[model samples]
Target: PTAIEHMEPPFWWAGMQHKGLQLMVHGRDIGRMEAALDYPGVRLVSPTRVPNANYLFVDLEIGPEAQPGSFDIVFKGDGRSERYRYRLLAREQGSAQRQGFGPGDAIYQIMPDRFANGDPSNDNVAGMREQADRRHGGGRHGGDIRGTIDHLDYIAGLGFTQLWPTPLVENDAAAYSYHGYAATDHYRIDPRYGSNEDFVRLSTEARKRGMGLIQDVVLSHIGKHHWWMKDLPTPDWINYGGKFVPTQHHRVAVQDPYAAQADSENFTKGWFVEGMPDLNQTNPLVANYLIQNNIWWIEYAGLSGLRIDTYGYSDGAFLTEYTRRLMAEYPRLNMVGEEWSTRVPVVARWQRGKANFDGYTSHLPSLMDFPLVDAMRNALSKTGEENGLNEVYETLSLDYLYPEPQNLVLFGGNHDMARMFSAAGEDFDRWRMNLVFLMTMPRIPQFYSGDEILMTSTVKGRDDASYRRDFPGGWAGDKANAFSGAGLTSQQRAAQDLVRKLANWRKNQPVIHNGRLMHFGPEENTWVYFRYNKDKRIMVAMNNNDKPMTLPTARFQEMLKGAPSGVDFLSGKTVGLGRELRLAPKSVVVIELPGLP
Candidate 1:
């Protein structure tokens, strides 16, 4: 007789917002058995048989009266019997009411495999297919949860309030599994990274330092080596009859007015890549499984937020239910989706309160502001009025298209793109401007790892592995240690110091968090803006010209009415607000105005 092999979720909580729970039971010929459980306030609704005899879907209703304890689930079949111990653990206190990331927070994004290696013992696990090879750009470099935990002080010192690491879930692919997007197991953390308990420790340690952890989730697809691939529960479990049909990458098709039905279907149903299989989320069983999995992680790990990968690539109805259920459970939890579109309308369609023309409603709270990223890149790299600062000014003017523009996440560059330094043509002045704009903007800001030190991918081509460079001090025997500022060039230290200063200053500025923004547009290679509220006011003036210029202060004073002298927030120097303000070429000044509240 063959015993049970897997049960997912492996364990669950007694008290969840949703009373119903589905258990996926897998074993050799387990579908032929009858499931029975003896427990108070817990009833086995049904044991659904699937096409494969190795899988069985068990539905259970866990009522509010149920107590947290262990129960035995007995399975009986033709001349065979087996018993499995199932657990229903107690929910953590105030787990449902946990707060999430918001405008007052700054996120630091890290690729775990490229950050640092604190535990070299797990570098090459026996069962994992790929071993740690630091020489190969695409290979795993052994950065684990321990590494992150060890550097919590360094991250917190940089004034980041939130940590968003790429997915740490199990990705058992033979090659290029370091990215962790293609998950092989949803319930388990990759052993090479660390154990499940280690992840909980990381979250707890981060929270102790006033930092929240944001998990990255992929609902669109799974790696080909997923255990479910061995024996699918149903014929419709995988999309396109389990064949590899590449997606068209037409993100706009979901919101296009005259889009073809085939294009829309292909965008949602086609496989992301040959090594990944698109899931059939339209299937109720699959939908239930995915939804429960997300809730399980949040409740178990005490996560503060989630970043959904490929948001529009899933079934619309499924996406709706997924977000609805999650929000229902964690009312204050924040979730941002990766729309990856530069058009505001296309990205806006996924926000929670958007009134879509097609009546397509989404419960997603936030989205990555790709349009702002595009504009910032173009504005910083160019020199004239057409595509320079005008590009950024125009993009911000379109904020009316979004319901909650302040909730959107803004960044100069991310893992998929080149570093901001490289994007700004390796110009230190332009890069500094990018950081200042990102930090002082209305939206929640995120910084990719190593961008503070001006890490670049220009020399190695803008490939995935090249852009995600390893941290200088992450490993032993490294000449440079960013944490202690050793062996760093003059320019690198300057950039790092600037980022640290700006981030720390912005941390206490409520005006920057929820302040009203006012801009004078771009003229003569200059852009000036003000972030002000009832309590305080901040003035940001930028000069992108190659030569020093005098900015006239008498252009009909509106925001600068009462301020005669202001202290420079960055340099601590007081300057008089006279007839004209002198600004150095390619420099920005953040002034804190002296005023009465």
Candidate 2:
């Protein structure tokens, strides 16, 4: 028999914003289930029959009369019924999750297992739920919470305010489960990665070093080996293998007005990947546990925020209640979800800051900004029809979709995709141009580890592991160590050196981190933009051409006015005004302009 024999689709629902209660669910059991609400203002509408037998859709009209917070949610499914206690966390609670984290701070993402191994003694311990196996490529590699605690200086020196490690939860899977995405025990941290106490200590240590921890969470699914897998409270607790089957891979269905009913069904219903089993947050027990789990981590770790893995793939009611719970805090902490869409509207929709077309709002405060990531890479490309500079210019145009454009996080590459160096086809000029733009853009710039020396994963053909390479100096006997520059390719060494200099220097600059940005026409494949605050101004011009190019000052009238005199951040030398600025081939320039009044 197949591992996933049940025919249910992994589930997700939506109903955030002021609308109070609207639900859209995916899976087969919706047809057999009956729902109700005692709250007078909230009424469940006729369920929409979505295609593919995966989506069970329901819409709720939550009138103004409805009270705040999660009440009792009654659900009947798979020949049984269950009651779930939902929470109504009052607005802006001053918890670790909401500290107003934004562009001024940089985030450092680490895969704990591969970062460092501070304690070798605990690798093969007795009585632990799981045993040690670092020999196997897919098995654990001896990185524990204490290991991270020991390396606080290495990370903080790199100028990051936040550290986001992949899931550290226990994964009891027999083999190849080192990444920790497939969680077996929610209440406890994985022994292989160290104990819960170790994780908490790591968080506290990070704060002492001037860093915050952003927990990467999964609301969509759980590992099949979860403790309750056999005696589930109700069959509806999970999607697929219960009553539904495969999900159609159609994500565009969510927003396409004329999108066929078939497409939307597949996008929401399909499993993101094979290993992860989609969860049914619609189940009361499941929803409560998920919500409680979130609060537990925040208070326990004193976390500064959260970076939800898959933002929109949860039951709508759960999303509403979960968001509401967080938002109902005294100090109003911040949370940014991983809604990896390049479209501004898509990312902005989840942030509570944006007023939506549906009039719905989510408590989510920020997004990952994939569109700018893609666009910046495109603009720095060796070839482009519209001035190569149009890439970033156009990407910023969509900023209208978001309420606060400055809140987005800017990055060249993360662990999942090709390194910016490789993505730029190993072109140094293009790489530098992209870097200049990244450092000067309006958003908060996050530098991925290994990106400074241009860490390029040699393992090609979509190797996520290759992308998530083992930090060379992390282990005991590693021959290729980044820290020592031993056995590193010349290019790798060069890249690492660059990171040490640029990142360290970036922390000292007053304008780059807290400054406001203003950009002008990127025509002729070149454009000028500035980073300014009351104290200082930094102007950057980027050109990707193979040959040198000149830009007229009239083109940048807004930034070039007033007997222009500026300084260069890199050289600290003054430059006089001119009708045109000269740019070297495939180069990016950082010219320090005058300060704001």
Candidate 3:
């Protein structure tokens, strides 16, 4: 007789669209037994054994009239029986109607371990593989959920509507596990980060401050130390089966017409890193497990949105179906995937509503705007290029390639990249331009935690430890505290205020959200664009030149026609809209055009 020690989706809610539920029961020789359940409105299907006798797949259907209750699942073999208790609970009132982050939102991205150290008690835990070491860059710095909860007011006060924390899931790797990408356990949060209850508190507390939580999910891989690594449910449960098969990272092959079969398979099947094992999503059991896990988190946490990491590296067909199922469950929820490609068509193909040539379909609503991010970096670094500003203009012009360009998430820099302050050539002017353009652009905008205060990393390019530094004043005895406005330089304070002003103003600007974007060709190292609906218009102008230049308004007659004047929202100065305008060098000016329909 074998006792069921582990079960995927330990419990479920009473109401869900998909009536059929597959439960994975794991134990020694658990597959040899027959499964039976005694509960009203619940019918059981025959149990199926996998290649390994340690695992069993059992199915059950719950009718609409089913009530929330506990039932016993009995397994019988050789005249002996084992019983496991299962519970079904009622869902929240607005579970299905929970809104997701969108173009109207400003998202603040945080790496939980680096954000704050609210509770020092859980800094180091017993039996955890790595100890918290603040001195080392890659080592755990001890920021937990309590630390984030302590600073919710600061985030919301910055006019950000959504918070996207990097994965809080358990990463039980021997070392460098603070980043939380590799999950040793899917159902539990890292003990150092706090219990699963702490995460729920973070979500519930955020809602009180008018902020939504966007959970980061890594669907393609799990940490090498994962529980499943010790026991094989099936030989093929993990791609390449315990072998080190690094991914080719041939992201283009999925959409490449002439790509070879072997190339595409290796891209999806290959491991992300030695510490991360690739998941074989093609397996039906693996597919079911992943899909259920995602829904479980959504309903459990009351999540506002989802962010999929290394999205292109996953199996393409599987992701499409994965997205379809989620959308079918919550039609209004938004999701964004990280494609990390500079090419428009490559990233565009993964978004929902795209008419791909290969007939590939995806219900994914948004993608991170990598092309725009790259263009901004290049343009900001350009010193003497004739049309440096034109690069950004051209990228925005290519919006026609995307099905819903406005839905994309625009960022100056993300966790895996160099700090935006460094990417903008360490110049405050460029940083201002980056922020102004992102805040006013026709897309969702995300900012790294310290971006508003001009955070800088000592090194560049995936220097995880250096880039994901702890927030100043997050811990006690920190001289510089950003939250309380302590010890910040004048320039830093100015930048912070700039972001708060622009973000707060943008929160209510429907023009910036759904309006059409129009631009005049770049001239003399200056670029100008407008966000407008029929009744309202906002003009954004940038001068990248070393010296101030006179920008003649007559050149933009199509947009400036018949408007006497405009208000500079940034400075509150009224500037003439008829003949010409003068702008200081290395500056961005946002203006509201008066009167239009």
Candidate 4:
């Protein structure tokens, strides 16, 4: 039997640096297990099994010059030492990996059904309530995976590292389903998008150009029309065990040690807004399939990572096990889950880096810091009673709760929310204030498709249809075209230009990727933060006051820790630390300077 927990290294070789790999099988006979590894060039460590139980722990080390080949690594278990096998491999080295697309990476999120429609053929999908017409709210405007595949250059030109459309799984339900969240088929891509093979190919092409493809997975819920609903698989195949149960909105029970039984039950069992039918992963078959599906996709698509949605709505234990098992195979693989909590501690608890109180743990590598998103939304707003200055500071104070808080994905708004401009009450000053924060904050950052271009739907609430309204030229015969740059609102074009410039400018800035950040809250309505590395430094200052203020740069200089000089990254001019800074009213600025080092 395998050990309860373990890992496989990147490679293995024989007779160069460290001889051959070693093994000490746990809970079984060590001598029996060691002899099992007797392949051509295989060497053994002190093969000693731990006392009592069937657990096994195997460790192997490869040397500087190991031949590249596939090997059937076998092991014996039970008192009789029955043999089992694992396919293992060693490959030739190229060079150490550079930092993977780092914080400087700007990912543009899109709803494929809303982004563009390359194949006019698939636009009129059958049995869906939404229209083939772009004017209809919540209607499927026929943006397919092929459409996105055809637009890689567009997204790449926008300076994005990864392109993650909504879940591509078949969601052939009735009306009102703009985003592909409630999945009906787990293994296959929706015919409307393309095919499973096309998905893998998308990743293949993306990799050649140094970009990654991210798959949005919904492990928590399947649409009510899912195949399983027709013929329930094993009585225990779903949440509530074959009964329909709505979930409680109590997402914080996972971290609240003092949570009541009722609260905990609600947290673990509640439905997510009623439309999404919760999946039951507690069943062994369900667990196995879910785990296998994740692995299959990673291998099949050559995907870089995953973005799990509605994380807190499902079975937490199963989700934990699923994460642990999946990562067991792909060590460097990254995943970010959406739990939508506004408290740092709440967000931190789900991240793999966080240590748990119990000996039990889930190996979640990252989570979306919704708290920061909310704070930025408020802080940048033009008309809010909140100071907008303290939101970030207070939220970040609880950062101690997260093990790898810096690795979290930070964003202001997504397709699901009202446009940040409206959320900020349609004020450009506030919009710029928000942009300063989005551009400067630590952690990986993502932007909704229209965010740079300020796309807004005239609909109310979380009207995804309005939010996911089609890009003008996706389909055929449309008078307005976002692609050809014809018939777009002036504001829309400006938003696009702003995003393009900001994104391209950030592409080569190491100061933003690995910089040390220092911030000072406004004494009144002015806020300032700095990004500094060993060689360069930059300051971002925002003033929310009604009028222009020649704010004294002395305080800002001290905030920069007595840096003698700096330059404005945006304006391309040097700024001495001696004079008061002239900040335009409600405008945001990025001042670059020499590094302290």
Candidate 5:
């Protein structure tokens, strides 16, 4: 006789589009036993037999006639039997129709361990491997959900409508678990960070302040110490398990017509790092498990959107089904995949409506706009003839490739990338221009936690640990506090106010959120664009020229027809849009065409 120790998606919701539910039961010799579950409207399918006898893949169906309750799952062989209780939950009201993050949102991406430490009691958990050490860059800094909760006022005050905290799932690793990428347990939250209930409170409390929570999901790999790693449910549960063959990381191979099957496998099946084991989504049982786990989190946590890390490394077919199943559960929920390619077609292929040559279909609504992000960095920071404002103009011109360009999420900087300030060669003007473009651009935008406060990696270039530095005011006794405007330089204060004003202003500006965009070619290093609809019009002018220039009124006759005086967004100064507009050197002038309210 064997005792059932673990079951994935420990429970499921009723009234799902798919009636089939595959449960992974882990125990000693559970796969060898005969399984049965006699409950109302619940019929058991054939139990899956893997090479490992310690795991059993039990399949069951919950038809419309099924009621939400707990039922006993009995497994018997020889003379002994084990009884496991499985529960069915009622779906949340309007769960399927929840609105996802979109162009109207101002997303703030935060890392829990580095943001702030609210509760010091759980900073060093008893059994968990990682410990708090604010002095070390790579070590956990004791920031948790309570810390984030304490600063919800600061985040919401900055006018951010969506909060995208990095993975909070349990990462009980011995070292470098501050980032929360390597998950030792899929279902439990890291005790060092906070409990599972704390995460729910973060979401619940965020909603009260008009902020939606976006959960970060990593389906590509799991920590090597994952419980199943010791005794896998199946031999192929992890791709290249025990053997440390790393991924080729040749993402182009995924869409390459001339690529070999082995090359594609090498890209998808290879491990990411030494401690992280790549998941084998090719296995049906593995695929079902991942899908059910995704649905469970969305329903359980009341998530507004999902950020799929390392999206391309997973099996393409498996990802297609994975996304399809989630969308079928919640049709309007947003899911963005991190493709991390600087090519237009490469990023576009994974989007929902992209017509790929291979006829590959996807249910994913949005993709991280890597090409545009790279273009922004290059346009502002890099030194080249093409690395000018024209780069931004040309990059956005390629939006025809996407079926829904506005759905794409754009960012100036993120946790994985260098700070936008450093990327812009540490220029304050360029930073403002970057924010103006980010907020006014024709896509959903995300800003890093410390980006608004001018956070930068001073010591090293491209160092992950340094780039994700602690927020100045997150912990007490900081010399320069960004949260309360203490000890910040004039430049930092102005930039923070700029982002805060524009973000809060954008909340009510429907034209910028969902509007048609038109841009004129860059002349004298100045670029102009208009975001307009039936109700309002916004004119954005960026002047990167060495000297101030005055625009001729006749050159913009098409858009300026019947236009009144333009009101500067930042200074509230009036510019005569009916005649000519003046632009200062190295400045971005955002004007309301008709007039500022």
Candidate 6:
């Protein structure tokens, strides 16, 4: 007799836009059983048997008339039988029409394990391989879903409308499982992070405070300890025949005309690392599994958006279908893919409405603007013939390449990069400029956690542990509490204040959110731009010089509209919009033209 060990997704909704549901059942010799179910509006399409005798892929059709109730799936074989109670849960009202994060929203990214530790009890679960050790930079630090839920008010106070926490899925690795990138069980939340129900509570509570939750999803690979590795359903379940082959990371090869076939293949098929196994998404079953996993999380957790990790590493056809199916299910939902290339063409190719030269169509709604990030960093850090500001100006000029430039997500730094303060050379003014541009730019904005307080990496260069530092005050007994604003230095408080002001101000400015943008090229270490619409206008001027510079208002006449005076939104002070405006050195002013209809 064979007893069922697992069935995923554990349960599904009755009226989902996607009618087909496949359950991966695991049991001893379960593949040889015949599956049947007696339930109205539910049909067993097939009980698929594969190379592995311990696994069974049960295909089911959940018809429109299916009720939200439990049904017994009877599996009988060789005079032995087992009955498992499967469930069809009712869908949440308006689940399909749930709005996603967008240009009007500000996203705050947090590394869960480092953000805070709300539950020390679950830090070292009995079954999980990893244990909590706050002393080690790479070790788990006990942060959990409850920590985030407790801080929802603090995040909302910063005027962030959306939260993008790094993946919370079970990592189950022996070490360095704190980052939550390599998923062992896609269906289960890491016990250290709390239960799946706790995640749902986080989402519900965040929404009550006007903040949406954006999930980080990884589709390219899985942790080496994933259960599938023990008994793979197919020989090709993992890429390269389950062998570890390093990826070339030649991202440009995916879109390069002269790129060799081998180069492109290596980039897509190679494993990210020895500890992570690349998934063969080209396999139909693999594709279905990944796609369904994403949908399940979205539906189950009530997510506002998805951030796809290593977006370009998967098979092109699979990515196309994955995005297509998700979009079909939730028409207005937003999903941003991370291409991690400074080249606009490489990043732009994955954005929706892009007319690729190779006729490749991407259903993906948005992409992380890596080119813009590079430009901003260079613009603020360099001072030679390059005229760093030109990098930013030129990058924005290439907006023609994107069908919807405003849909792109622009960030100063992420968990994978150096802190923005360090990237800006630890210059307070330069950091302020970065924040101003990020908040006022045309694209959506995202801020990495702790960046608001000018958090910098302890290491000299790109070290994962250094950048993903634990947030001060996340744990009990910490001297500094960022949430309470206690024990913070004046400078740290000032930085946090600047972020709050700018983010809150941007939250209400429709001109900055959905308006058109025009800019004047950098001159004399200064750059100026305007965000305008039919009824309102905003002028942003940046002076990178060491001394005060006078900006001639005449050059911006088209946008200024001859207004005699305007108000500085940041300082809440009225300023003269005369023929010339004085700009303090290393400063940026966000001015709103008065008397607009």
Best by lDDT: 6
Clashing pairs in 5: none
Candidate no. 6 TM-score: 0.98
How high is each candidate's TM-score?
A: 0.97, 0.79, 0.98, 0.80, 0.96, 0.98
Summarize candidate 2's per-residue lDDT along 256-299 as a digit string, tens digits: 55678666545544456665667777666567567656766776
Indicate the TM-score of model 1: 0.97
Each model's lDDT: 0.89, 0.67, 0.88, 0.67, 0.86, 0.89
Worst 10 residues of 6 by lDDT: 379-388
Better of 1 and 6 by lDDT: 6
Model 4 stretches with alpha carbons more than 4 Å out: 1-102, 125-133, 273-275, 358-360, 382-386, 458-461, 558-565, 573-576
- Which parts of model 1 have CA positions greater than 4 angstroms off? 384-387, 459-462, 594-597
lDDT of 5 by residue, 130-236 (tens): 76888898999888899999999999999999999999998888888888889888888998778888888999999999999999999989987788778777777
**If both were scored by lDDT, which would come out higher, candidate 1 or candidate 2?**
1
TM-score of 4: 0.80
Better of 2 and 4 by TM-score: 4
lDDT of 1 at 388: 80
Candidate 1 per-residue C-alpha lDDT over 1-597 given as tens digits, one digit per residue, 9 for 90 to 100? 259988889899998889998998889989888999999999999666777888888999999999999999998999888888999999889889999899999999999998989999998889888877898988998899999999999999999999999999999989998999999999999999999999999999999998999999999999999988877778889898888999988888878899998988899999999899999999998899899999999988999999999999998899999999999999999999999889988899999999999888778989999999999888877765442887788899899899989999998678888888999888898888889899989999999989988888863444787688899899888799898899888999999898888888889999999998988878776888888888787888888877887878886278888566687776677766777777788888888874336
lDDT of 4 by residue, 247-279 (tens): 667777766778787776666665565666666
For residues 1-597, could you state the per-residue lDDT of candidate 6 as single tens digits?
Answer: 249988888788899877999888889988878899989999899555787878789999999999999999998897899889998998888988889889999999999999989888888999889878999989998998989888989899999999999999999999999998899999999988998999989999999999999999999999999988987778999999998999979887878889998888888999999999999999998999999989999998889999999999999999999999999888888999999889897899999899999999889999999999999988887855435798899999999999988989999799888888988888899888899999999999999999988888753556898898889889999998889999898989999999999999899998888998989999877998988887678888888877898877888888786888777876777767779888887878888774245
Clash number for each model = 0, 39, 0, 10, 0, 0
Candidate 6 or 2, higher lDDT: 6
Error of 3 at 223 (Å): 0.3
Residue 438 in model 4: lDDT: 74
Candidate 6 residue runs with Cα over 4 Å from true position: 384-386, 458-461, 595-597
